[PDB]
Amino acid sequence: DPLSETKCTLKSFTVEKGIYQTSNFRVQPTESIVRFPNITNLCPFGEV
Amino acid sequence: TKTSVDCTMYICGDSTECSNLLLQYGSFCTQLNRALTGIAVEQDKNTQ
Amino acid sequence: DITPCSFGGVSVITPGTNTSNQVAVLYQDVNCTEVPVAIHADQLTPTW
Numbered sequence A: 001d002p003l004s005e006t007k008c009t010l011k012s013f014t015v016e017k018g019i020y021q022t023s024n025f026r027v028q029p030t031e032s033i034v035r036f037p038n039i040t041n042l043c044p045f046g047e048v
Numbered sequence B: 001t002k003t004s005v006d007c008t009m010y011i012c013g014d015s016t017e018c019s020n021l022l023l024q025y026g027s028f029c030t031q032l033n034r035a036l037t038g039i040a041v042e043q044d045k046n047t048q
Numbered sequence C: 001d002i003t004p005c006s007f008g009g010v011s012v013i014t015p016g017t018n019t020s021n022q023v024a025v026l027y028q029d030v031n032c033t034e035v036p037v038a039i040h041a042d043q044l045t046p047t048w
């Protein structure tokens, strides 16, 4: 919970009155997207 | 002006693997945060 | 266009632990409708 995260940052079991900056937050990704060209064939590199 | 810096985003960014081995450098960012917090608080004391 | 996912710091407003254990959480530079829609568990739970 938010209170415990303050204790760990302060390295103490008591918290004085005030406002403390604990961590940063980030929006997690929704999913994954792959966009690649739509041409599809076989490359004649085996002949080499 | 009072500014804040997010260490993880600035150095690595959106590379998850980069952040993981970044912790091996220790508590470098913690010192940076405390220094900048001290500057920001003093700016309000100046105006007071 | 490419716009990075929303991010920011997190700060916790608390009185003394002697006084109470209630806290308040401030999302720095986040519009209130842009907070992630966490129903049960979908983020990394940074200061839930």
Ligand SMILES: *[C@@H]1O[C@H](CO)[C@@H](O)[C@H](O)[C@H]1NC(C)=O
Residues within 6 Å of the ligand: A038, A039, A040
């Ligand atoms: C690839 O996309 C183009 C659109 O620029 C379309 O004309 C073509 O038919 C597509 N081919 C395949 C195999 O999807």
Ligand SMILES: *[C@@H]1O[C@H](CO)[C@@H](O)[C@H](O)[C@H]1NC(C)=O
Residues within 6 Å of the ligand: A045, A046, A047
């Ligand atoms: C070349 O020939 C060998 C057999 O001699 C075959 O295994 C291999 O797949 C061939 N390479 C190609 C078709 O690209």
Ligand SMILES: *[C@@H]1O[C@H](CO)[C@@H](O)[C@H](O)[C@H]1NC(C)=O
Residues within 6 Å of the ligand: C031, C032, C033, C034
């Ligand atoms: C915050 O909420 C939504 C997000 O775009 C928007 O409609 C509203 O105008 C925003 N207000 C401010 C002050 O950012």
